[PDB]
mmCIF file of C-alpha atoms in Angstrom:
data_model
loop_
_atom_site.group_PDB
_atom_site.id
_atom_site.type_symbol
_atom_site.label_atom_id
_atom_site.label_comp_id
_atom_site.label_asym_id
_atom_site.label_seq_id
_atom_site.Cartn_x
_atom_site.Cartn_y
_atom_site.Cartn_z
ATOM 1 C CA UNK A 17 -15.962 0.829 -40.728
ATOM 2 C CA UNK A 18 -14.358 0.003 -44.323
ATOM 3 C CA UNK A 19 -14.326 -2.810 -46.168
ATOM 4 C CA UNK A 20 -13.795 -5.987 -44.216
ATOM 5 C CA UNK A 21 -10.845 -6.997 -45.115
ATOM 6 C CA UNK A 22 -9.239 -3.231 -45.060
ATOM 7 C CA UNK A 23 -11.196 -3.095 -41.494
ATOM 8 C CA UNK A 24 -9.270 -6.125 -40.224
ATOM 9 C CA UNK A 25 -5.233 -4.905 -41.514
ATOM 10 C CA UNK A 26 -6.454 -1.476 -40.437
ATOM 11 C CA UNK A 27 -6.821 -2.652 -36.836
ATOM 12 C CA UNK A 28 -3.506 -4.401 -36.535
ATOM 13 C CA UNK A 29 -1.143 -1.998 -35.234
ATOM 14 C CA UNK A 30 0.155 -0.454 -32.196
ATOM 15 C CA UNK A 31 -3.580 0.813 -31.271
ATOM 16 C CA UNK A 32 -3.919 -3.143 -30.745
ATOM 17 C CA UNK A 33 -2.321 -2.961 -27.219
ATOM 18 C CA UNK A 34 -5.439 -0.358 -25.924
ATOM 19 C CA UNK A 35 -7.785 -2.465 -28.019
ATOM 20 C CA UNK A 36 -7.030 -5.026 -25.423
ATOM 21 C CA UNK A 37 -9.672 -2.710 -22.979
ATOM 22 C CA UNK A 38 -12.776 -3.054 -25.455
ATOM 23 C CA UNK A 39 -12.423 -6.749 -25.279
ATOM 24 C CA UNK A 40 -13.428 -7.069 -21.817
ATOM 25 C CA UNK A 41 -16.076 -4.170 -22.225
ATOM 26 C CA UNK A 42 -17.618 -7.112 -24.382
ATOM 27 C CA UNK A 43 -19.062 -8.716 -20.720
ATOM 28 C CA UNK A 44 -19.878 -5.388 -19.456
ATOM 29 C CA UNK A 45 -20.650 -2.648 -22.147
ATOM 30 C CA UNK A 46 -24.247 -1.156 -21.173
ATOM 31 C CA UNK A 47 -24.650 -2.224 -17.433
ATOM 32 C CA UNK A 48 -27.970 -0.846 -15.454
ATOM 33 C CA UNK A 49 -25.473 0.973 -13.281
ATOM 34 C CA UNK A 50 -22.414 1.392 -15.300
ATOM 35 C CA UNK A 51 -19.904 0.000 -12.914
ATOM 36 C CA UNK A 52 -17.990 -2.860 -12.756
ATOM 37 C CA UNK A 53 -19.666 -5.849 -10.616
ATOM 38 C CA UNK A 54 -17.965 -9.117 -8.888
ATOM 39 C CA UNK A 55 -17.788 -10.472 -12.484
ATOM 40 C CA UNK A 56 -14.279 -8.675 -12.852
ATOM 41 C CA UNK A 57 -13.018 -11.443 -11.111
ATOM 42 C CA UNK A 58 -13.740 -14.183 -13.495
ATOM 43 C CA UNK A 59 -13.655 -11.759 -16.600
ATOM 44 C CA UNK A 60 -9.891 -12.686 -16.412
ATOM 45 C CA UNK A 61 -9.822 -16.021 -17.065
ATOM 46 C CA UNK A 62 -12.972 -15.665 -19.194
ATOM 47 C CA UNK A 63 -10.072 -13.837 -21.791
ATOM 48 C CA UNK A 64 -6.119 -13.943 -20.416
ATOM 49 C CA UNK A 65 -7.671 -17.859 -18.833
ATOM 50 C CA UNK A 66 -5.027 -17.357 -16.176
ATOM 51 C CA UNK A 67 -4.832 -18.887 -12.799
ATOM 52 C CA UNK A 68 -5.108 -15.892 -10.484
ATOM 53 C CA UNK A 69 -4.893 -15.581 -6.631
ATOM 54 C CA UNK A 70 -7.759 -15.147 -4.008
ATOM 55 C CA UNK A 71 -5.702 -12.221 -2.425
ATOM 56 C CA UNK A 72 -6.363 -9.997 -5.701
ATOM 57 C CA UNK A 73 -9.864 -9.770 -4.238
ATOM 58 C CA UNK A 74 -8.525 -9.165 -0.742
ATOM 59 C CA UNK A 75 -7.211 -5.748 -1.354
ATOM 60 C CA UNK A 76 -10.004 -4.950 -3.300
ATOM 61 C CA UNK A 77 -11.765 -3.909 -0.244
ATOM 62 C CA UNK A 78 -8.733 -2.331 0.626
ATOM 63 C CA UNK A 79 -8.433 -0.168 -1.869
ATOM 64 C CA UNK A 80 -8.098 -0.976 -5.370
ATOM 65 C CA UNK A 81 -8.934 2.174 -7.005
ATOM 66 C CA UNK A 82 -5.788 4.360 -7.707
ATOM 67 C CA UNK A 83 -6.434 5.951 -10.911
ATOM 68 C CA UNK A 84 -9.280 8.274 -9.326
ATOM 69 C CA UNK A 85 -12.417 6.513 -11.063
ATOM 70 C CA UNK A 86 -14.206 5.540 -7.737
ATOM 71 C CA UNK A 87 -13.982 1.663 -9.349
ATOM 72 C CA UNK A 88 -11.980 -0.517 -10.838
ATOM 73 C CA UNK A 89 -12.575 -1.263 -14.915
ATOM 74 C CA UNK A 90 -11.337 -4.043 -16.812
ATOM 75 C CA UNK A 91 -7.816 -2.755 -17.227
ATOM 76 C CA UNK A 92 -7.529 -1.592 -13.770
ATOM 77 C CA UNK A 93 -8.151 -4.765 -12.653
ATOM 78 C CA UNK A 94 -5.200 -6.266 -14.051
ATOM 79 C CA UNK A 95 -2.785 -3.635 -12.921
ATOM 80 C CA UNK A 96 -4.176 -4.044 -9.236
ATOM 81 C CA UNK A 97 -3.652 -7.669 -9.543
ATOM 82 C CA UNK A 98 -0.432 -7.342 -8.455
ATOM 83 C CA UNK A 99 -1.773 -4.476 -5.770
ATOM 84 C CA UNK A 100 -2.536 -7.265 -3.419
ATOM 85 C CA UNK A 101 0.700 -7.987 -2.552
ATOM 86 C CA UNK A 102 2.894 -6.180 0.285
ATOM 87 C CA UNK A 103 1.253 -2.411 -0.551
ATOM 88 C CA UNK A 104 1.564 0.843 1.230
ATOM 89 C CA UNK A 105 -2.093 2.199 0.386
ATOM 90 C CA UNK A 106 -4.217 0.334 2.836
ATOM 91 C CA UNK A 107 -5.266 3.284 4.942
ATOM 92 C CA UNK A 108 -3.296 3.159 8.333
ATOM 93 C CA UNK A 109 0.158 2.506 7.614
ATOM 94 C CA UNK A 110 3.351 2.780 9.967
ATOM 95 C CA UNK A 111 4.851 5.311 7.648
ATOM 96 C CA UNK A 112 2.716 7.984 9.849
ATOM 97 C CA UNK A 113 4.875 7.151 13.392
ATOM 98 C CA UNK A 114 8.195 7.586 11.055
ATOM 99 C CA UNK A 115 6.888 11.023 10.518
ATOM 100 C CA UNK A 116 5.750 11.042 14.008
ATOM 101 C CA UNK A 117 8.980 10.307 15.879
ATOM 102 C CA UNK A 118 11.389 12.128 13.261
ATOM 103 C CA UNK A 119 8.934 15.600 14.009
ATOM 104 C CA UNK A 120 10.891 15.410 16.727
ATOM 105 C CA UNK A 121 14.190 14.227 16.785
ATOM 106 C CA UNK A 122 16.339 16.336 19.712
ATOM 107 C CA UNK A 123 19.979 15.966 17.743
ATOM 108 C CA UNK A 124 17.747 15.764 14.189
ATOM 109 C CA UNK A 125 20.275 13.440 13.326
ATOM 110 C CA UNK A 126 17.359 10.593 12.870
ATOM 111 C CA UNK A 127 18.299 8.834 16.121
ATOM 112 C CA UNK A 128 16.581 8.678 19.306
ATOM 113 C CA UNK A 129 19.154 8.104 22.424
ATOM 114 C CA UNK A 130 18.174 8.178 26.273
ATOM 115 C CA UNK A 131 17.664 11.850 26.122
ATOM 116 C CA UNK A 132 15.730 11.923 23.120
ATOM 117 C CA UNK A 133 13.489 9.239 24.255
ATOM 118 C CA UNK A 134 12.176 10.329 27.314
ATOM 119 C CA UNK A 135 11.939 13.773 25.847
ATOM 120 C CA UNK A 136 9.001 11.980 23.963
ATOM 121 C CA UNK A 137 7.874 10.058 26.533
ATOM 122 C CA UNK A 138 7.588 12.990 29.385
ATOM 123 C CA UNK A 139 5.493 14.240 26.790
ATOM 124 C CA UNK A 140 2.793 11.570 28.055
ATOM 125 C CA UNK A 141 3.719 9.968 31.606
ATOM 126 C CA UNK A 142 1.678 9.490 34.402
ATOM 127 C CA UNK A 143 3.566 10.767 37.588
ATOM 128 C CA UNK A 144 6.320 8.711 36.613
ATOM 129 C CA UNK A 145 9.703 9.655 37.132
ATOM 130 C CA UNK A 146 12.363 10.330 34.957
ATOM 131 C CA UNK A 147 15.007 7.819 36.594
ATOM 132 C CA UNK A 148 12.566 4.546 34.883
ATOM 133 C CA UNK A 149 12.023 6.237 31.483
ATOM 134 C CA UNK A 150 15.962 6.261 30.700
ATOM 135 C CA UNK A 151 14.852 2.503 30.747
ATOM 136 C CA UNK A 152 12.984 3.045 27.577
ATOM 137 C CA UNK A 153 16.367 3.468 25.568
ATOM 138 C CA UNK A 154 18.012 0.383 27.503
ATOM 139 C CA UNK A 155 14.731 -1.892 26.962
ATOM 140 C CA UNK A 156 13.784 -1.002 23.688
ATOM 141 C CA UNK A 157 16.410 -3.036 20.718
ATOM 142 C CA UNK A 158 15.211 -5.388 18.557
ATOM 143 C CA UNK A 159 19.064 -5.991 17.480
ATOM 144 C CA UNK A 160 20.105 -5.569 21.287
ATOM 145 C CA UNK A 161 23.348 -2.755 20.280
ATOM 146 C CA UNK A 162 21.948 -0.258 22.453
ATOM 147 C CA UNK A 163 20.358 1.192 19.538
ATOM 148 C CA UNK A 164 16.751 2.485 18.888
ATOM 149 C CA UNK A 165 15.887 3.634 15.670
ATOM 150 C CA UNK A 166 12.691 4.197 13.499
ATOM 151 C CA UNK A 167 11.918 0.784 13.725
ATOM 152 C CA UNK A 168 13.442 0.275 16.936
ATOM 153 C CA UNK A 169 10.766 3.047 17.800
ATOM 154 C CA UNK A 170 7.763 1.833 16.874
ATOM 155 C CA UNK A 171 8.819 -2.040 17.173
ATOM 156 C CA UNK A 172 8.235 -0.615 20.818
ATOM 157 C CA UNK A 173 5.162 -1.265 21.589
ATOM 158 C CA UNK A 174 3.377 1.859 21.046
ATOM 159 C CA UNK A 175 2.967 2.744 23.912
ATOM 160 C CA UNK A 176 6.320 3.696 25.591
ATOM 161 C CA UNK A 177 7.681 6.259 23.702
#
């Protein structure tokens, strides 16, 4: 707030690159509710005029907030554009099982052979007997090399194992 010419070279320095927030506060600046609305969608090509994806919008019921705002602002809407793609923060992941069936791990060598496999499986049969869950380890390859690992483990079925 000096001089308008002074106000204008005064402006034009690195500080521009965060000054790229307040632009899009221009749509949104004194909302009723002070949140972000659908319009973050279009506020992109009403600036950047890019061609963006539906999927952006996909995740966004996901979860799009990872900055710990409870919503997404201008800014965070670009950086989450990219969220949509192949994430791991959609809730229910497989990650957990990799936890789940290294907890275990008989030889803790992070394989699971005959033994090790109907260790977990005893764990839930249903008068079954132990003679058909050695099976599990000569069913279960997704490679067929008498081999079950993580993803040999869940790639199951979840539900033997």
């Amino acid at each position: 707030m000096d001089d308008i010419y002074k106000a204008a070279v005064e402006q034009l320095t690195e500080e521009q690159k965060n000054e790229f927030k307040a632009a899009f506060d221009i749509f949104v600046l004194g909302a009723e509710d002070g949140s972000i609305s659908t319009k973050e969608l279009g506020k992109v090509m009403r600036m950047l005029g890019q061609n963006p994806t539906p999927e952006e919008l996909q995740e966004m019921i996901d979860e799009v907030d990872e900055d710990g705002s409870g919503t997404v602002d201008f800014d965070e809407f670009l950086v989450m554009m990219v969220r949509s793609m192949k994430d791991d923060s959609k809730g229910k992941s497989e990650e957990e099982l990799s936890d789940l069936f290294r907890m275990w791990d008989k030889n803790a060598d992070g394989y699971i052979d005959l033994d090790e496999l109907k260790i977990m499986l005893q764990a839930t049969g249903e008068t079954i007997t132990e003679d058909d869950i050695e099976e599990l380890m000569k069913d279960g390859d997704k490679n067929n090399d008498g081999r079950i690992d993580y993803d040999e483990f869940l790639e199951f079925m979840k539900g033997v194992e």
